[PDB]
Amino acid sequence: SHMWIGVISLFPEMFKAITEFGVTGRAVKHNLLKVECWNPRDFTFDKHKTVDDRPYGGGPGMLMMVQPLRDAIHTAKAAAGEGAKVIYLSPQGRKLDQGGVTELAQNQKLILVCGRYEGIDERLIQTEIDEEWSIGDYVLTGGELPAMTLIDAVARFIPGVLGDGLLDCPHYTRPEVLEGLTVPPVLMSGHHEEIRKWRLKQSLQRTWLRRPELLEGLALTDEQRKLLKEAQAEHNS
Amino acid sequence: SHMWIGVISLFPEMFKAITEFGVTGRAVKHNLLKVECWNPRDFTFDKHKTVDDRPYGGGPGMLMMVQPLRDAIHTAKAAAGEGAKVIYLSPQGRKLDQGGVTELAQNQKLILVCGRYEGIDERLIQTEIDEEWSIGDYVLTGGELPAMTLIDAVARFIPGVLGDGLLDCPHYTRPEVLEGLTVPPVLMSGHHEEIRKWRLKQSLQRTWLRRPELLEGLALTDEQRKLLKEAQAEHNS
Ligand SMILES: NC(=O)c1ccc(N[C@@H]2CC[C@@H](O)C2)nc1
Ligand SMILES: NC(=O)c1ccc(N[C@@H]2CC[C@@H](O)C2)nc1
Numbered sequence: 384s385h386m387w388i389g390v391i392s393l394f395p396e397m398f399k400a401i402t403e404f405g406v407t408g409r410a411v412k413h414n415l416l417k418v419e420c421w422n423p424r425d426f427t428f429d430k431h432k433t434v435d436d437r438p439y440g441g442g443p444g445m446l447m448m449v450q451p452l453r454d455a456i457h458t459a460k461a462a463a464g465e466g467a468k469v470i471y472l473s474p475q476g477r478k479l480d481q482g483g484v485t486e487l488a489q490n491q492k493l494i495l496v497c498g499r500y501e502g503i504d505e506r507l508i509q510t511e512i513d514e515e516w517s518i519g520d521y522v523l524t525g526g527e528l529p530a531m532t533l534i535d536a537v538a539r540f541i542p543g544v545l546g547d548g549l550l551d552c553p554h555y556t557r558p559e560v561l562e563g564l565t566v567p568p569v570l571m572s573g574h575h576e577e578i579r580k581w582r583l584k585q586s587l588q589r590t591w592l593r594r595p596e597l598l599e600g601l602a603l604t605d606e607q608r609k610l611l612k613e614a615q616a617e618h619n620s
Numbered sequence: 621s622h623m624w625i626g627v628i629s630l631f632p633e634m635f636k637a638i639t640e641f642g643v644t645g646r647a648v649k650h651n652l653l654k655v656e657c658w659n660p661r662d663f664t665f666d667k668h669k670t671v672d673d674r675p676y677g678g679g680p681g682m683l684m685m686v687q688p689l690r691d692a693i694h695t696a697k698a699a700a701g702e703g704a705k706v707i708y709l710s711p712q713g714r715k716l717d718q719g720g721v722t723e724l725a726q727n728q729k730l731i732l733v734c735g736r737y738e739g740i741d742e743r744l745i746q747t748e749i750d751e752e753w754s755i756g757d758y759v760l761t762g763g764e765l766p767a768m769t770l771i772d773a774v775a776r777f778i779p780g781v782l783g784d785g786l787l788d789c790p791h792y793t794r795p796e797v798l799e800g801l802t803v804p805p806v807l808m809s810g811h812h813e814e815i816r817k818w819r820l821k822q823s824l825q826r827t828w829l830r831r832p833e834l835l836e837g838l839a840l841t842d843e844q845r846k847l848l849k850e851a852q853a854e855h856n857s
Contacts, residue, residue, distance in 0.1 A: 394641040400634035400768075405736065406761040436793040440807035440815045444783070446793040475787045475826065480757040499642065505790035506801040519756040520717040520834075523772045524643040528765065531637075535760045546681070550712045553742035556673040556683040564743040570677035578677045589712065597757075 384542050387417045388534055389459040389467065389494040391452070393434060395420035397527045407535055410544045418534065421459050423451035435500050444501035452496075452503060456511050459494050467492035469513045472526035472533070473502065476515030479533065483516070487533065488540035495533065497526035548601050550594060552585040580610065588614035621779050624654045625771055626696040626704065626731040628689070630671060632657035634764045644772055647781045655771065658696050660688035672737050681738035689733075689740060693748050696731050704729035706750045709763035709770070710739065713752030716770065720753070724770065725777035732770065734763035785838050787831060789822040817847065825851035 390398060401407040402418050410416040423434050436448040460467065468490050477483065496512065518529040538544050555566045569581045587610050590597050603611065627635060638644040639655050647653040660671050673685040697704065705727050714720065733749065755766040775781050792803045806818045824847050827834050840848065
């Protein structure tokens with residue numbers, strides 16, 4: 384169940400960060416993930432290969448020039464064939480979370496449009512973009528890091544790439560004692576069921592202490608209710 | 621007011637995506653931003669340069685091996701001198717938003733620790749990390765894209781790098797008509813005050829329609845209350 388992702392970007396070499404390294408690098412090498420980039424600069428026709436343009440109404444910044452960006456998008460859509468969802472990365476988009484990742488990962492083909500300067504023409508969003516997505520409520524210099532973030536997150540759902548609403552539990556490895564801090568004995572016990580429950584209780588405790596709002600969205604199992612109650616009682620000494 | 625950012629990563633070449641391209645690339649070239657990387661693999665001593673290790677208690681994955689990671693961190697801290705805040709990137713961290721970016725941007729020195737595999741030993745978080753930060757509620761294969769995201773966001777606050785709680789307004793550039801869609805006449809008017817108010821009204825409308833929770837956190841000006849009321853009346857026809 385491989386995934387094809389088309390990318391529109393003025394800086395396609397940025398995507399080497401995911402295509403050449405680590406788990407995602409391996410996914411690309413093994414043809415589980417295909418990332419293909421089109422650069423608006425290649426679709427310019429003037430001598431200086433101009434990719435920006437002035438905003439109507441004035442303002443300090445520039446926008447992506449429409450014609451090169453539009454042509455790049457059309458070319459990516461033709462390469463993708465039917466069924467590709469076109470996504471624009473911006474702070475105005477739907478905020479990404481793990482549920483959203485799982486939704487996006489159901490697509491066999493995505494096209495990711497990465498804006499630079501002050502963004503892109505609103506009418507291109509109307510005519511060319513299927514969905515707007517944000518990776519978080521903060522502003523970046525370009526849509527490339529958000530696109531790579533999205534790619535990395537969905538790649539984890541592709542079969543062969545890798546080897547429940549709660550924060551992760553603490554993890555420990557060698558040595559047994561590190562600056563006076565010992566590994567919790569239960570993890571040394573070999574008692575698989577005790578270890579499972581300890582890890583689950585830790586996740587529940589950490590979620591409650593750090594991100595209590597996340598618990599509101601969950602229908603806890605009987606076991607989770609019990610372990611959370613235990614953690615909260617211990618916290619209250 | 622330049623910024624120095626130390627990075628601990630098994631894949632330092634990923635950071636070329638921000639140090640070699642665009643606005644952040646220029647910031648690095650102009651010495652406004654300095655990014656310096658240490659690779660735990662360089663601090664290994666065994667023949668096969670091992671950087672992972674088995675989790676106590678079992679489990680499917682691996683963790684970062686403590687000794688090479690710890691030594692890399694210590695080396696970065698020595699290079700940084702006094703006053704560097706050490707940050708670990710993880711989904712268990714404080715969720716990044718623009719207010720958090722502005723807070724982080726007050727630091728002259730940061731050290732960013734990027735985890736791989738299933739993460740790092742909890743005792744290293746206790747002994748070496750000042751703050752844990754997340755870029756959003758989703759899981760990635762590594763902390764590098766979150767680190768670069770953080771770097772990009774804070775870099776925007778460094779003087780010379782670039783040329784209020786609401787979503788951005790729509791932007792338009794040439795041509796005047798695009799697939800039948802016209803530029804809003806106010807933007808062609810040259811009336812700077814009318815354009816300002818239109819843009820502000822659009823931001824208020826878009827925030828209300830897409831992210832109404834964001835408005836709850838704001839103390840709107842009299843002007844903003846008026847324009848939002850107008851937008852909501854127009855929406856209700
Ligand atoms: N939070 C995000 O997902 C995000 C996306 C894009 C972005 N910056 C680009 C620059 C110009 C405009 O296209 C938007 N910043 C943040
Ligand atoms: N949302 C985030 O900021 C984020 C940070 C890290 C991450 N993955 C790394 C891999 C191993 C562990 O160190 C964490 N995923 C997501």
